[PDB]
Amino acid sequence: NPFQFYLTRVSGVKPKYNSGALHIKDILSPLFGTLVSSAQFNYCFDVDWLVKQYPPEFRKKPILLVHGDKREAKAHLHAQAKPYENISLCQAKLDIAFGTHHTKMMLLLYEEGLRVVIHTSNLIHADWHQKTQGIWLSPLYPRIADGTHKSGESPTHFKANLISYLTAYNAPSLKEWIDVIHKHDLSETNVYLIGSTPGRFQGSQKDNWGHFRLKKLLKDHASSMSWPVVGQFSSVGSLGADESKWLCSEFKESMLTLGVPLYLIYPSVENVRTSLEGYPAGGSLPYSIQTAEKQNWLHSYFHKWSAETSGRSNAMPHIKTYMRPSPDFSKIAWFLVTSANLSKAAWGALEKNGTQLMIRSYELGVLFLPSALGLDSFKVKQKFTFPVPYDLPPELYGSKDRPWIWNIPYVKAPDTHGNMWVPS
Numbered sequence: 173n174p175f176q177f178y179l180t181r182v183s184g185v186k187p188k189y190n191s192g193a194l195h196i197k198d199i200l201s202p203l204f205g206t207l208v209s210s211a212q213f214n215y216c217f218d219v220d221w222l223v224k225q226y227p228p229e230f231r232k233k234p235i236l237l238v239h240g241d242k243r244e245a246k247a248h249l250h251a252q253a254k255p256y257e258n259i260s261l262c263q264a265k266l267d268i269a270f271g272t273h274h275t276k277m278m279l280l281l282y283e284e285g286l287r288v289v290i291h292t293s294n295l296i297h298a299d300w301h302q303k304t305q306g307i308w309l310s311p312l313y314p315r316i317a318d319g320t321h322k323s324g325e326s327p328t329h330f331k332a333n334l335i336s337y338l339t340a341y342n343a344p345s346l347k348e349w350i351d352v353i354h355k356h357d358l359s360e361t362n363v364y365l366i367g368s369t370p371g372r373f374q375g376s377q378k379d380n381w382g383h384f385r386l387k388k389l390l391k392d393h394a395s396s397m398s399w400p401v402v403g404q405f406s407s408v409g410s411l412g413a414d415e416s417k418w419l420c421s422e423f424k425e426s427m428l429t430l431g432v433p434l435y436l437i438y439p440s441v442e443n444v445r446t447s448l449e450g451y452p453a454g455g456s457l458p459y460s461i462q463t464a465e466k467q468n469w470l471h472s473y474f475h476k477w478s479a480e481t482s483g484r485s486n487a488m489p490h491i492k493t494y495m496r497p498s499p500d501f502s503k504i505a506w507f508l509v510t511s512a513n514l515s516k517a518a519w520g521a522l523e524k525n526g527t528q529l530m531i532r533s534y535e536l537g538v539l540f541l542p543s544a545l546g547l548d549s550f551k552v553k554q555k556f557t558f559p560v561p562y563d564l565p566p567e568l569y570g571s572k573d574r575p576w577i578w579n580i581p582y583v584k585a586p587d588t589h590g591n592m593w594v595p596s
């Protein structure tokens with residue numbers, strides 16, 4: 173299994189649909205290594221819940237929480253953590269407004285080596301219960317024989333890329349994790365790291381982050397051959413007055429690079445209503461009427477959530493993925509799993525006559541390139557060759573479908589649990 177790409181367990185589907193699926197408890201289990209220390213980067217945290225996901229024997233090992241909370245929210249987080257002597261926090265600077273620290277990553281230091289986990293789930297019960305979420309598991313990275321001279325680097329430059337990502341936080345607690353990574357052999361890594369970090373980037377620095385980083389990797393590491401682009405996400409930023417402002421111009425341009433139809437997959441009201449969760453799934457799909465009414469054009473790009481291949485049609489997506497399938501959808505030129513949703517905040521927007529990339533948020537993903545495996549393309553695994561976790565080709569919204577919008581009421585039809593949705 174070259175990909176090490178997994179979905180989270182979904183409770184309440186047939187056990188067959190959970191066979192190759194992982195819950196956080198499985199990720200933190202002793203079968204994965206003898207835990208010594210860990211860092212949990214994320215957006216939302218339930219500390220009590222989180223600590224319980226660790227095996228009892230490991231529950232007292234040091235844990236660093238890397239978050240972006242401020243003021244009263246920071247207060248609350250610290251409050252959640254206080255009861256736990258072994259937990260420290262690192263507040264990631266968010267110097268630009270409307271930025272979030274959105275990256276989901278685990279750094280797991282064991283007696284036997286180091287593991288890196290890049291995934292899409294918040295550290296709260298509901299994100300791991302009945303949602304479709306994605307996980308990439310690094311291999312167990314051995315410690316470098318403390319008597320040998322080696323970089324421990326991979327052909328994909330993952331090790332240096334991860335260190336640069338951590339370096340940008342400028343945070344004392346992360347330097348220690350940077351030192352740990354220095355000491356390990358990450359050479360077996362076959363994926364590319366794609367990060368976002370807050371900033372306004374000029375010249376050479378453009379290629380380091382966001383969609384320009386992706387564009388750069390696709391230039392150097394794919395090659396060419398009406399192959400569509402597919403984008404799949406749970407949050408939608410303000411994209412501009414029309415497609416030419418950002419979506420089809422700079423964003424899609426990065427995405428189509430190699431060496432054009434755009435399918436966007438976003439849950440409809442109907443997908444949410446009949447989900448395992450019902451309407452409360454919409455709490456994790458925060459598309460506001462405010463934003464949506466500014467850009468009604470975007471919605472003709474939208475396709476339904478359907479995941480029969482993985483049995484998760486009813487498990488609302490909090491995973492985010494982007495990919496480049498062939499015209500018949502039987503193959504792909506690459507696959508990206510990331511925390512980045514469909515927003516300029518996450519991906520970057522060009523400022524000052526296209527000479528500046530402005531990014532608002534921390535985001536992190538892994539890119540699977542056939543070349544890193546010595547292939548030209550991946551065959552799509554038809555029934556959850558790359559494991560595409562949702563159905564192809566994507567299915568267009570019906571005429572009566574609407575995109576889920578979180579902050580309006582739905583009272584005409586009850587959801588899966590006989591409830592309505594009246595936000596307020």
Ligand SMILES: NC[C@@H](O)c1ccc(O)cc1
Binds near residue numbers: 407458
């Ligand atoms: N339910 C919390 C809400 O703020 C939220 C919504 C979507 C996310 O990805 C993360 C958090």
